[PDB]
């Protein structure tokens, strides 16, 4: 029913970790390089505790805020309370990106049509899990590694996934 | 329609600059090394720009050189005035290396099936620069640190990708 592409952008380790008390366990400043890359131009889908870690509109796209608080209202940021919502809001929209975190996944899970991953080859202590998938009618259509330096400390690659049907 | 598998050979760097002045922005004579075992045995397609610069026939290899002037020569070198007219000379070649400069992988852009790319980690100045590619269906096959010394001043990486669909 909606006309929007749907996508998931996502960095996890190896047992799928995402996130330790409520931040994120590496600090990769290549791999965000990545992700304003990929996702400038289009609308970012955040629950809200993704986007209140953050604290500020990343500019450049439609900062797009999940909550169930009727009343929740943030300065150069929309506030939706639902996919239905959501899914209004970005009704005209060539491509979203939903960008966590683990609840906001959850939540649109049975609506994703392309996957963004970064796989990082390493298991970090953590608290919060990007969700299991059947990869089943998934097709990889882009995979390359990571820079590996001294700023970007761990290895990882960068993987597309388009669902087939 | 053409049979030969068409791949590009380029260096870049962090803002896909290939030139300034008409020359290359950097010596990298151990690049250079890579350039001429990966396309030993095989033809190199160069725009008259390009190849003026070089101003002789690389060994080795046949030395296409692409222009629109129908009374163009260079001893030691095949002429071409066309795509078409390129896939007619290499028609049972196994693999065609396009080597630049920007109006020529311009021009071959829509029929690259392999990239041999390599990354430059710097930003030169220039005003020569490699088209945008969207590299959806394609996958890194190969990867490799570049040797920096002091020959070789800049982080500089080898990557291969190939074209899926
Ligand atoms: N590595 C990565 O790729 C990413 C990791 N993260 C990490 O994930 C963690 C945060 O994730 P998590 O704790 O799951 O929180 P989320 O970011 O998913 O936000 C949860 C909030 O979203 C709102 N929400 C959830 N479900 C609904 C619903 N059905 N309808 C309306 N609103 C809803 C609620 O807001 P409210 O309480 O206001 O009602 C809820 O508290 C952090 O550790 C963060 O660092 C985040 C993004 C990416
Ligand atoms: N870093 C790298 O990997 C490389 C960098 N370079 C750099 O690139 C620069 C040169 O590139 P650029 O200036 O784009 O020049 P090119 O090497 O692409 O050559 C341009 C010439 O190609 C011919 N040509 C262009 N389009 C067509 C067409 N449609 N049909 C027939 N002939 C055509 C024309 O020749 P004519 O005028 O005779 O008609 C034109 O003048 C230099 O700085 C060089 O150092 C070059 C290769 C690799
Ligand atoms: C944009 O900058 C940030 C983003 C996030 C967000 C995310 C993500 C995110 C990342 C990093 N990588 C991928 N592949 N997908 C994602 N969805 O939550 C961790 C938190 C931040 O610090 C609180 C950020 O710094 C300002
Ligand atoms: C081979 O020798 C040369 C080649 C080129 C060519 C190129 C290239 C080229 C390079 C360097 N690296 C990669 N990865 N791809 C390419 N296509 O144009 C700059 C110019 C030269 O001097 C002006 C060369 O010295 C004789």
Not at 2 to 30: Q, T
Not at 39 to 45: A, E, R, S, V, Y
Not at 131 to 154: A, H, I, Q, R, S
């Amino acid at each position: 029913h909606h006309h929007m592409r749907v996508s998931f952008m996502v960095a996890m380790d190896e047992n799928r970790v995402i996130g330790k008390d409520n931040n994120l366990p590496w600090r990769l400043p290549s791999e965000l390089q990545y992700v304003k890359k990929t996702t400038m131009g289009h609308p970012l889908i955040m629950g809200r505790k993704n986007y209140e870690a953050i604290g500020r509109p990343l500019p450049g796209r439609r900062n797009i805020i999940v909550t169930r608080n009727e009343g929740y209202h943030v300065e150069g940021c929309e506030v939706a309370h639902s996919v239905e919502e959501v899914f209004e809001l970005c009704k005209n929209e060539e491509e979203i990106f939903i960008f966590g975190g683990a609840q906001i996944f959850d939540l649109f899970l049975p609506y994703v049509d392309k996957l963004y991953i970064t796989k990082i080859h390493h298991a970090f202590e953590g608290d919060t899990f990007f969700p299991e998938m059947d990869m089943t009618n998934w097709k990889e259509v882009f995979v390359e590694k990571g820079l590996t330096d001294e700023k970007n400390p761990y290895t990882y690659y960068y993987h597309v996934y388009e669902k087939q049907q």
